[PDB]
Amino acid sequence: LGRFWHISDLHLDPNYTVSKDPLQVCPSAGSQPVLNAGPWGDYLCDSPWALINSSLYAMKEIEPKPDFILWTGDDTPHVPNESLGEAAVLAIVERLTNLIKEVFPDTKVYAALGNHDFHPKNQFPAQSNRIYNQVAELWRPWLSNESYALFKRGAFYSEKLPGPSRAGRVVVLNTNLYYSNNEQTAGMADPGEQFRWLGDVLSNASRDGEMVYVIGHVPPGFFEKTQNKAWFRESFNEEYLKVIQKHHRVIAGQFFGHHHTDSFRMFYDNTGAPINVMFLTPGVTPWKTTLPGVVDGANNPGIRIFEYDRATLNLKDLVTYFLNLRQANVQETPRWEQEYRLTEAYQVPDASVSSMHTALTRIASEPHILQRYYVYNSVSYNHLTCEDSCRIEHVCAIQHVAFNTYATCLHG
Ligand SMILES: *[C@@H]1O[C@H](CO)[C@@H](O[C@@H]2O[C@H](CO)[C@@H](O[C@@H]3O[C@H](CO)[C@@H](O)[C@H](O[C@H]4O[C@H](CO)[C@@H](O)[C@H](O)[C@@H]4O)[C@@H]3O)[C@H](O)[C@H]2NC(C)=O)[C@H](O)[C@H]1NC(C)=O
Ligand SMILES: *[C@@H]1O[C@H](CO[C@@H]2O[C@@H](C)[C@@H](O)[C@@H](O)[C@@H]2O)[C@@H](O[C@@H]2O[C@H](CO)[C@@H](O)[C@H](O)[C@H]2NC(C)=O)[C@H](O)[C@H]1NC(C)=O
Ligand SMILES: *[C@@H]1O[C@H](CO)[C@@H](O[C@@H]2O[C@H](CO)[C@@H](O)[C@H](O)[C@H]2NC(C)=O)[C@H](O)[C@H]1NC(C)=O
Ligand SMILES: C[N+](C)(C)CCOP(=O)(O)O
Ligand SMILES: [Zn+2]
Ligand SMILES: [Zn+2]
Ligand SMILES: [Zn+2]
Ligand SMILES: [Zn+2]
Ligand SMILES: [Zn+2]
């Protein structure tokens, strides 16, 4: 039984300062007053370094020798582009990279860029550029010669897993190419040929008897905290689904971030069979989202460990740990605690597709499992009751990655 960490959406705010002026605590809060800010963060702000540093040392205390770490990006604060130039973006990525290397010096890391890990934000090109080149240098100790060259061209690559994993591979995607807000890829059907490449990698995995973990930042499908919000342009969403439907047999897991909340996505084939599951891990940043329509969209800082079978990559469980930020900010040292273990929360034997399908059916039919899922969705920040509209937004998002079936579900 192996273990790996999945961390995402650290979002450092470099200028976080405990101040008596509520409007000069953190630029990531915009114009919002930040009253009595604490040293470990505030729900209106992106992460101070002290929170990020806390999260990495909490990982080391919980499991200092993971088989590997998945890191799915988004390192910089939610501020205007004019406040955050290219040099600062790269310095922030480098600082976080060095922290991970310092705390886990012997651990392989599989790292993807998030949509904020660029200047201007979200404008990821389908060709080489200074950011891809420089990040490739930062992550070179983690990259094969082949992955190094591929990262410079498109910030995507695939790597063998280390022993003792029998026949495993991690595929690292740049799904920021597919974000609707990315004008660099408008009018391109296969930017960087990433979909063609991905299919070839997965065909190779089948030929070679390997199983694959796919990771990336921006997920396909919709955002469970609202209605009708998808990140991918529709054509890219369709193409991603087509890849999963063709190659699901070799995909043992999908691991994404970007939402900052805790959820999962089911994939089905045209016979209704469940064929894959994507796990959306919460963020370390607690930052209350500015997305229109979302009310009180903050979360507690979260980190996640997966348990897996090294021989098959079958996912046996996940444990999510969290920092109760409200409590931590009256304390001398933040102390992270277990939030939940998946098998216990949903009374399923493992984290397989069949088990996650059962979890979904219980979320959709049992009030107390729905509420349990909903509390964990914000990393136990919000304990209010998830009513009917909330229920339908979450169930439809978990169940339907496709645009058209999601929309029909929302008629419910
Ligand atoms: C699916 O599997 C196939 C194998 O069946 C795989 O094809 C292999 O791809 C690798 C990687 O591109 C090829 O190896 C390269 O070969 C070329 C030509 O000999 C070399 O130039 C490369 O080596 C140099 O590259 C750098 C310079 O650009 C140097 O810095 C570096 O140190 C090397 O000196 C590299 O070895 C290999 O030839 C093919 N094999 C076959 C049979 O085609 C394919 O890539 C897989 N598909 C995917 C999407 O991964
Ligand atoms: C955070 O604040 C910096 C300015 O802070 C100063 O420069 C840092 C390098 C560091 O030494 C601090 O202690 C200093 O007090 C912002 O950077 C400036 O942004 C303005 C635009 O508003 C720009 O005109 C300046 O050229 C920038 N300065 C530098 C040195 O680049 C930065 O934007 C703030 N970060 C965020 C996320 O808002
Ligand atoms: C990052 O977090 C670590 C761990 O909490 C801090 O290192 C500890 O600091 C305390 C007090 O200085 C010591 O008692 C411990 O021995 C240190 N190490 C460990 C493993 O606990 C470190 O100071 C933090 N760094 C920053 C910049 O905040
Ligand atoms: C709005 N949101 C926070 C839920 C998703 C966008 O995430 P981010 O890329 O701005 O960090
Ligand atoms: Zn984010
Ligand atoms: Zn954003
Ligand atoms: Zn099939
Ligand atoms: Zn993001
Ligand atoms: Zn507690």
Descriptive notes:
This protein is α/β, with parallel strands linked by helices and 412 residues long. It has one domain: Metallo-dependent phosphatases (Purple Acid Phosphatase, chain A, domain 2, 4-Layer Sandwich), CATH 3.60.21. Helices cover 32% and strands 18% of the residues. The chain has a six-stranded mixed beta sheet with strand order 3-2-1-10-11-12. A hairpin with a 7-residue loop joins β4 (157-160) and β5 (168-172). It binds a molecule of 4 linked components (NAG-NAG-BMA-MAN), a molecule of 3 linked components (NAG-NAG-FUC), a molecule of 2 linked components (NAG-NAG), phosphocholine and zinc ion (5 copies). One zinc ion (ZN) binds next to loops.
What's a quick, concise take on this entry?
The PDB classes it as hydrolase. Keywords: phosphoesterase, extracellular, membrane, phosphocholine. This protein is of the alpha/beta class.
